[PDB]
Structures are given as C-alpha cells and as structure tokens.
C-alpha cells in the first residue's frame, strides 16, 4: 500500500521509480526493466538528463576497481562497478548495501525527452554483467528487507503512473482472478506462448514459431515484438479484419503514421489481438486480449498513430504496451508469471484489455519451446 502509485511515466518514455543513493542521499529517477539484471546510474553529465549520481559527494561509496559494458536491443553503456547504500522512499524505511554501476559513456541509451537517469534490472542472476556472481538489486532486497521473492507491476499510462510492489501482491490493484503461466527458464522472464488470434481468427502457424528463440515479459521494451514470420502473419490478419480499406506499407514498419483529422479516434477500425498462454496445469490455457487502444499508439488538426508492434530477429517480447492492460506478478519464488484484470487500464471509461480462461491445450504440443 506504501508502494501504490510509486511509478511515473508510460510505455513510451518508460516507467520509473524514485531512489535515494549514497550519504547524504542523492535522488534519482530509475527505469524499471524486467529485461536486464544490472542496476546502473548516470555518473557524469549528459545532454538528455537533468541529474546524475556524483560518487565524490557520497561518504559511503566504494569502488570495486573494474568496468562493465552492458548492451541492450536499443542502446549500450560503460561504467565503473561500485557499492553504495540505497533507500526506496515509497515502500521501505531502511537502507540497503547494493552493487551499483556508474555510467561514464553511453550509445543511444539516454534519449531526448526521457525523465529517468538510471536503470533497475529486475531479471535473474544469469543476465548480470560482468558475471552472475555480481549480486542483483532484487537479490540484495529479498535478503536484507525480509520480503518474499515476488514483485508485481501495475502500469497505468495507456493513451493520454503506476505501481511497483516489491515483496508481494496488492489486492486493490486488480479485479477478478489471477492466471499463472510457468517460467520456462530463469534468465529473462521466459514464458510459453501457444497461439495468437486476430479478430477471433487463429494464425496459420506451428506453436514453436512463437517461442523462436524465446517469448519473454519485458517492462523495458516499449512495443510488442514478434519474430519476422509471426509479424508478417499478424500484419496480414490485422489488415484483413480492419475497416481501413487499404494500408501503406510504411505504417507496418513505423516509417509512416496513420493520421485522423477532427477529434476522431482510430480504435473502432481495428480488431482485438489474443495471446494464449499455458496454465500451471499443462492441459489448460488462458488468453490475454489487447484492444486497439493498446497497439495503435499516439505520437491541420491531425492526431497521428503508430503501429505498436515491431518485427524481431529471434524473440517474442511482451513489452510495456501489453503490460499496460494487466496487473503482472513476477512470482520468482513459485517459478511463475501471473496476469489479472487491472481497473486502472482504461481509456475514455472503457476497458482496453480482457483476460479469459480456461481453454483446452489438446490441439497443441505438450511443449512449444524449441
């Protein structure tokens, strides 16, 4: 309850938590990323950040005497690895000794307009750089704060804040039931996708295409990313079920935007998208449905929208675009990811998503992960 509405931002500019670092404390805005495992802050001035962590001003700051380079899908940074005391004002009332990387060089990491000046990698030890032996932030917090090995996210920034609950589930942040999908591999939050349906129509694809090379839940990825073959099938299915007579090829790639004049909204011209996930009882599945309000994103009185789905080389990424419709539980202690209906996930007083189940897995393989 102390952690309710402790995030700021949206899928576009990222969801970020306020953190107090060092002695005396310096306040920073930290991006919540379930796609990486390093805690890093800007340590020198930069053109697209208004604040940075100054290690010279901290009496508790200690250097490990080595560097680290971390590469993402979009962006990279190089920093010194050190240690310092951290407090999370909104939630905890005690300090923690954590590993911290101070960025002194970056390439397409800190972009213009962003309100955050650091990153919080909430994924597993396996992804920590330089190695797995570099204690992650959440591993330090679970050990030092006496909390269950669970965290949950409620993203409320769809269209035109949120909550990061460290240590549990807040019942006031969801409605109905929680559906759980097993974590297949503990590196990223890798889950199993069984089927995709556009306007109630199933794609003509083997369930393995969806887990090529992995299907993950990532709060640091803006859009829904699909392997090229899956992506082409989705574009074909969306165009067929849409009320827009013809589309320009650049709309699908992000090179062209769809612009409506007057006060007119796009959402009634597009179908729903459903993703089927395996339940904890393998004979069952549940589906998470997103309405156009989540995948048709705002950017002569024109209002322009981009396609909120992008092709990927070898990964299906459930971005902050999909997470904006649900209360998502990262249940590390029980090796599972939970999804629930989020009351805050609504634009113009209407739901932007749905959750339904159970369904039969008989028409699909016992394992869809190649």
């Amino acid at each position, epitope marked *: 309850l102390a952690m309710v509405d402790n995030l700021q931002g949206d899928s576009g500019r990222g969801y970020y938590l306020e953190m107090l670092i060092g002695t005396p404390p310096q306040k920073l805005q930290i991006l919540v990323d379930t796609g990486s495992s390093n805690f890093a802050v800007a340590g020198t001035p930069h053109s697209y950040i208004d604040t940075y962590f100054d290690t010279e001003r901290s009496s508790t700051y*200690r250097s490990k005497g080595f560097d680290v380079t971390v590469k993402y899908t979009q962006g990279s940074w190089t920093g010194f690895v050190g*240690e310092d*005391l951290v407090t999370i004002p909104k939630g905890f009332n005690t300090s923690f*000794l*954590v590993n911290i990387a101070t960025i002194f060089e970056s390439e397409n990491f800190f972009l213009p307009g962003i309100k955050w000046n650091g990153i919080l990698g909430l994924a597993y030890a396996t992804l920590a750089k330089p190695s797995s032996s570099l204690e992650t932030f959440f591993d330090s917090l679970v050990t030092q704060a006496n909390i269950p090995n669970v965290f949950s996210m409620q993203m409320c920034g769809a269209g035109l804040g949120g909550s990061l609950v460290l240590g549990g589930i807040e019942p006031s942040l969801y409605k109905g039931d929680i559906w759980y999908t097993p974590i297949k591999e503990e590196w990223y939050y890798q889950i199993e996708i069984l089927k995709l349906e556009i306007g109630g129509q199933s794609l003509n694809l083997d369930c393995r295409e969806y887990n090529a090379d992995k299907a993950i839940v990532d709060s640091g990825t803006t859009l829904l990313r699909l392997p090229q073959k899956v992506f082409d099938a989705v574009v074909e299915a969306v165009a067929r079920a849409s009320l827009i007579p013809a589309f320009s090829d650049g709309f699908w790639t992000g090179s062209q935007l769809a612009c409506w004049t007057n006060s007119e909204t796009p959402w009634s011209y597009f179908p729903k998208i459903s993703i089927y996930l395996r339940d904890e009882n393998s004979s069952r599945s549940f589906r998470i449905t997103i309405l156009p309000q989540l995948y048709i994103q705002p950017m002569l009185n024109y209002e322009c929208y981009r396609f909120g789905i992008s092709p990927s080389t070898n990964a299906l990424v459930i971005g902050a675009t999909v997470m904006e419709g649900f209360y998502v539980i990262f249940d590390r202690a029980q090796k599972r990811v939970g999804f629930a209906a989020s009351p805050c996930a609504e634009i113009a007083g209407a739901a932007v998503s749905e959750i339904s189940g159970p369904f039969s897995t008989e028409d699909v393989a016992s394992n869809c992960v190649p």
Partner: nanobody
Amino acid sequence: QVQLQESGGGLVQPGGSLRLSCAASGFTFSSAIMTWVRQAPGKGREWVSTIGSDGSITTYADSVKGRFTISRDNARNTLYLQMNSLKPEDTAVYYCTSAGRRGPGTQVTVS
C-alpha cells in the same frame, strides 16, 4: 560455481558467545558483498548483517546491533560473525549468502 560453507555453531546458555566462519570458493570473494541471514524454527527468514567487499562498510539488523560484529579476511576468503550476549531468540540456522547462493548453514541453539 559459487561455494560457501559455514561453521562455529553450537549450543550455548543465555549470555554466551560464538564465532561463526564462512569459507568461500568458486568466485572472486574480495570483490563481493557478503551477508549473514538466519532461519529460526516457526518464524520467517531474518536478515542479520551485510559487509562491503573491502570490509569498511557494515550494516546490522536492529535486533543484533551492539551484540554481533561482522568481519571478513579477503586474503583468507573468509567471512565472520562474532555473536556475544546471546539470547534464546537467536536460536536459528545461520547462513552465509552472496548473489542468490547460500551455504549448507550452521545451527545455533541458545537454551
């Protein structure tokens, strides 16, 4: 991989003392944050103490402050916990932990 092994646990009377040790291998110990955690019967896991890689930065749970002292010898790859003025509430399996890994533990009983 990361290897940790605790020792020095025993059975003492209230007011007693114990010196816990933890031997580490498989990772660069001299570059790691080290923690002591305890698990008492019928209660949840409780954080005891944390020490920074060079030993200068130390933190303690309010329940152990002034009674326990965490230390480390980086040349010898060993972490320590000096437990003085022991009380029955301190009965627990004490674990040595780093980067999600723990040792097999060391049982402490205070009559």
